[PDB]
Amino acid sequence: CPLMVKVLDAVRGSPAINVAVHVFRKAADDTWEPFASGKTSESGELHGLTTEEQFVEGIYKVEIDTKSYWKALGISPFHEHAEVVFTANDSGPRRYTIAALLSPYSYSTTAVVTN
Amino acid sequence: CPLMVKVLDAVRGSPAINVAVHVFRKAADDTWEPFASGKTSESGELHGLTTEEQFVEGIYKVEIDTKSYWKALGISPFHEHAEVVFTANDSGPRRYTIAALLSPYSYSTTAVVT
Amino acid sequence: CPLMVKVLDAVRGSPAINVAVHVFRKAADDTWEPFASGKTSESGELHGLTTEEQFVEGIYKVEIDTKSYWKALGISPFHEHAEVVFTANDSGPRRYTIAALLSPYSYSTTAVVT
Amino acid sequence: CPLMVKVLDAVRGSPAINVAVHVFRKAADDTWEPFASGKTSESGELHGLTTEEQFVEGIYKVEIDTKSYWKALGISPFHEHAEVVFTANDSGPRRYTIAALLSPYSYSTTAVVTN
Numbered sequence: 001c002p003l004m005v006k007v008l009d010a011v012r013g014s015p016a017i018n019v020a021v022h023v024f025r026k027a028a029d030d031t032w033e034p035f036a037s038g039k040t041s042e043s044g045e046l047h048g049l050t051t052e053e054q055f056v057e058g059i060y061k062v063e064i065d066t067k068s069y070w071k072a073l074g075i076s077p078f079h080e081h082a083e084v085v086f087t088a089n090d091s092g093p094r095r096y097t098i099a100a101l102l103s104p105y106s107y108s109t110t111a112v113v114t115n
Numbered sequence: 116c117p118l119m120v121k122v123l124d125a126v127r128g129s130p131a132i133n134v135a136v137h138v139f140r141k142a143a144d145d146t147w148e149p150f151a152s153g154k155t156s157e158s159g160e161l162h163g164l165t166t167e168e169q170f171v172e173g174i175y176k177v178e179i180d181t182k183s184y185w186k187a188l189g190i191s192p193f194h195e196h197a198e199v200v201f202t203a204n205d206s207g208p209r210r211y212t213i214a215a216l217l218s219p220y221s222y223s224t225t226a227v228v229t
Numbered sequence: 230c231p232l233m234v235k236v237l238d239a240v241r242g243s244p245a246i247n248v249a250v251h252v253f254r255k256a257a258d259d260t261w262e263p264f265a266s267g268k269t270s271e272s273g274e275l276h277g278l279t280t281e282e283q284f285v286e287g288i289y290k291v292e293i294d295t296k297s298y299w300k301a302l303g304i305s306p307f308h309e310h311a312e313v314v315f316t317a318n319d320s321g322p323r324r325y326t327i328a329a330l331l332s333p334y335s336y337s338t339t340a341v342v343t
Numbered sequence: 344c345p346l347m348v349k350v351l352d353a354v355r356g357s358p359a360i361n362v363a364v365h366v367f368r369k370a371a372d373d374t375w376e377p378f379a380s381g382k383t384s385e386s387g388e389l390h391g392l393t394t395e396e397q398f399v400e401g402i403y404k405v406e407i408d409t410k411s412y413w414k415a416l417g418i419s420p421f422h423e424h425a426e427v428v429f430t431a432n433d434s435g436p437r438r439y440t441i442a443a444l445l446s447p448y449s450y451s452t453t454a455v456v457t458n
């Protein structure tokens with residue numbers, strides 16, 4: 001499990017559950033091709049998105065559907081979604097934990113990269 | 116000045132100066148067309164990106180070239196850039212302030228709509 | 230105006246208005262003595278807390294009454310208040326801007342020293 | 344384990360290791376009495392600070408010695424430390440995860456409260 005996503009809710013002080021996450025990889029033609037997708041669990045985490053074999057060097061985009069999350073709670077959010085774009089494994093395989101803290105008009109995202 | 120961008124540096128505790136910012140608007144064909152661009156000033160701010168006449172309802176993407184900013188400081192950042200995608204509602208006098216706080220492996224962004 | 234405080238609301242995407250702010254300075258006996266206080270304005274800012282003459286080197290604590298702010302909006306917050314403790318160095322012309330972004334169960338604070 | 348602290352480093356994209364944490368409880372005389380202390384592990388986490396029996400209702404202060412952390416890395420930080428003050432268990436026992444993301448001139452803290 002080289003790619004993990006964790007989403008927290010800053011309004012309720014709880015994990016953000018059932019948040020849709022889509023991952024894309026930049027193709028040779030500068031196009032974003034679907035790579036993997038899923039929804040966060042009860043712990044606000046999403047595991048098993050890919051494997052070390054499939055997760056090759058490249059530029060990846062992790063899109064977190066924050067808008068749908070907030071609407072389901074009756075709150076009108078600012079962002080359409082949260083996007084995290086990064087180059088991965090360019091110097092060998094690494095483990096990536098992408099964390100996002102969500103608020104209706106703000107979000108913070110950090111990466112924890114393990115070797 | 117309905118749209119303003121402010122970028123701060125969390126490592127040095129200062130405005131993020133000369134950060135390239137590109138704004139795009141989603142076109143009818145779901146394509147991002149260039150809308151405006153510029154670089155943050157000494158105060159880490161970018162004003163005059165557009166006018167109220169030109170800034171119509173739609174989905175906009177504010178792209179902040181964070182990578183180039185960090186590389187210039189000798190720090191290898193994590194993100195390729197920071198992106199803020201939102202819908203400009205246009206329902207009453209509204210000024211949009213997009214703020215971003217930058218760290219090498221993290222960034223936070225908030226919108227101040229007044 | 231060497232010390233300024235800015236408070237934003239991450240839930241409503243607006244400045245945090247009328248937030249009580251208390252500033253303390255650590256005394257010789259390791260006690261926090263009141264230094265200045267006020268409430269954020271409509272722009273979520275608090276200016277004129279002190280002067281360069283009065284703002285000498287020392288350890289300061291900026292306390293933001295976040296609890297009262299959230300309760301007034303009908304939201305039960307997590308924190309009793311937000312505290313920012315720092316050392317004013319006083320080594321060259323320096324203006325201190327203490328910014329805080331508030332959410333019911335979270336807050337972020339950054340210092341912009343220019 | 345009703346009280347957990349997790350600290351991340353936003354500059355290096357890694358857990359903040361060996362960060363000293365001191366917890367205090369407000370006494371009857373409005374004084375902060377030492378409650379527990381420890382240092383974050385390799386995963387940037389601090390467990391076993393207290394037990395459900397000892398962690399009674401009250402106002403607690405979690406102090407994270409961020410200054411010492413940054414100085415050890417050769418960076419001059421802004422804050423003397425990060426403090427998180429909250430009322431705990433006022434409506435029954437809860438599990439509290441106090442998370443902090445650190446940068447030299449900024450820090451963010453969130454609480455995840457479980458029942």
Ligand SMILES: O=C(O)Cc1ccccc1Nc1c(Cl)cccc1Cl
Nearest residue numbers: 214216223224225328329330337338
């Ligand atoms: O915008 C963000 O998310 C970064 C951040 C973090 C903590 C405290 C304040 C801020 N942002 C900020 C600042 Cl530094 C100035 C003016 C307006 C805003 Cl929204």
